[PDB]
Amino acid sequence: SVEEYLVHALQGSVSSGQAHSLTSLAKTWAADNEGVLLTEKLKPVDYEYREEVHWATHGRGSFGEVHRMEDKQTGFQCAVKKVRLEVFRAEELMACAGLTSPRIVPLYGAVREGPWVNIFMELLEGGSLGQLVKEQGCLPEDRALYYLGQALEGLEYLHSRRILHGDVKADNVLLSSDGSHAALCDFGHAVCLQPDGLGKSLLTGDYIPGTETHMAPEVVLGRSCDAKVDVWSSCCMMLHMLNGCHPWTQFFRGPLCLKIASEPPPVREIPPSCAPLTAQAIQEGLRKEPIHRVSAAELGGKVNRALQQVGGLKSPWRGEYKEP
Ligand SMILES: [Mg+2]
């Protein structure tokens, strides 16, 4: 209404503004150079911010969609996620913009150029939790608990704001230079939960999930979904971290969605040598029925206690190769 008059003003130009503008503009895209930049270090020139003209590229995502970039005026280096326009979802920015949490990769701005949405964000120097698991087969339990713990703090943030990530997994967790900090990214599968708590459903075409192996049973059953899907995924992530491979992967080859539906939870993939409280945390996080599944916050507590049970975090950042 007033947002309509507003967006028309924002269109056709790249400006330095706030998150609300970006969000509003974003909705436009989800339905020629324009956008909003949320940091001083990324500076438009004369209403424009074009690739190879104002900023240059220097690929690491599921789609090789993410690059190191540099602003040609300012010298500042960050990351660009290229997303095609016809596929773009405002929830990528909605579940991201102005979210002041150290567990969520900060958004630096987003700029449309032609059929491309260029999403700018902090470049975290230590890469993805996924790459870390690849490099060193699997992670020590305490290290595994540590990162799950930090991902849960980030999800607790999202959920309390009525936001569901949609695709929680090691590849979508990023790490600082020392590996001390972990923060969520890729909100491409994020959904905004409407006033009535739980929402959408995969079959209606609103919650399109990201990674099959990490997908909760209520998703596959075409049931209504809430934040609880993230909690299931985060434990699939936990299994990935502990075993050096996704759930279901080592056992079933074909349409997993049908297996996830009717099998017991991947609970059998829990390493026998794990601390009982770690096993319990995963077990509670992998309850097939969402209502009885613990919340991110509830799991955070159990995870926190389990880390203490294993003598705290005393594993080196990078050292041992631990065979899958
Ligand atoms: Mg990704």
Q: What is the C-alpha separation between 252 and 259, in angstroms, rounded?
A: 8
Q: Is 65 annotated as a binding residue?
A: yes
Q: Is 156 annotated as a binding residue?
A: no
- 148 alpha carbon to ligand 1 midpoint, in Å? 17
- 311 alpha carbon to ligand 1 midpoint, in Å? 32
Give which of 115, 124, 113 is closest to 54, Cα–Cα. Answer: 113
> Which of helix, strand or coil describes residue 89?
coil
**16 contacts 48 by C-beta, under 8 angstroms:** no
For the chain, the 3-state helix, strand and coil shares in percent, each to the nearest 5, are: 35, 15, 50
Q: Where are the domains of the chain?
A: 1-123, 124-324
Using CB atoms within 10 Å of the CB of residue 261, give its burial: 0 to 12 exposed, 13 to 18 middle, 19+ buried: middle
Q: Is 254 annotated as a binding residue?
A: no
Q: What is the C-alpha separation between 103 and 4, in angstroms, rounded?
A: 33
**121 contacts 60 by C-beta, under 8 angstroms:** no
Using CA atoms of 250, 255, 261, 262 in order, give the dihedral in degrees to the nearest 10.
-70
**148 contacts 300 by C-beta, under 8 angstroms:** no
Q: For the structural domain made of 1-123, what CATH number should be given?
A: 3.30.200.20
Q: What is the C-alpha separation between 216 and 196, in angstroms, rounded?
A: 21
Q: How far apart are the first and last CA of the chain?
A: 55
86-122 per-residue burial string, b: 16 or more CB within 10 A, e: under 16: eebbbbbbbbbbebeeebbbbbbbbbbbeeebbbbbe
- 5 alpha carbon to ligand 1 midpoint, in Å? 34
- 172 alpha carbon to ligand 1 midpoint, in Å? 5
Q: Is 43 annotated as a binding residue?
A: no
Active site residues: 167
Class of 124-324 in CATH: mainly alpha
In the block, residue with structure tokens 């926190």 = 304
- The neighbourhood of ligand 1, an ion, using CB within 5 A, equals 61-62, 172, 186
Q: Is 63 annotated as a binding residue?
A: yes
**90 contacts 83 by C-beta, under 8 angstroms:** no
- How would DSSP label each residue in 143-200? HHHHHHHHHHHHHHHHHHTTEE-S--SGGGEEE-TTS--EEE---TT-EE--SSSSB-
Beta-carbon contacts of 84 under 8 Å, excluding residues fewer than 6 positions away, are 115, 116, 117
Give which of 7, 207, 266 is closest to 89, Cα–Cα. Answer: 207
Question: Treating both helix axes as pointing N-terminal to C-terminal, what angle do 228-243 and 276-285 enclose, rounded to 10 degrees?
Answer: 140
Using CA atoms of 228, 169, 127, 308 in order, give the dihedral in degrees to the nearest 10.
60
Tokens of 26: 């974003």
Counting every residue written for the chain, the total comes to: 324
Using CB atoms within 10 Å of the CB of residue 304, give its burial: 0 to 12 exposed, 13 to 18 middle, 19+ buried: middle
- 198 alpha carbon to ligand 1 midpoint, in Å? 25
- How would DSSP label each residue in 33-76? EEEEE-STTS--BTTB--BTTTEEE---STTS-EEEEEETTT--
Q: What is the C-alpha separation between 159 and 273, in angstroms, rounded?
A: 32
In the block, residue with structure tokens 């599944």 = 293
275: left (phi over 0), alpha (psi -120 to 50) or beta: beta
Please report, as a single letter, which amino acid is at residue 312: G
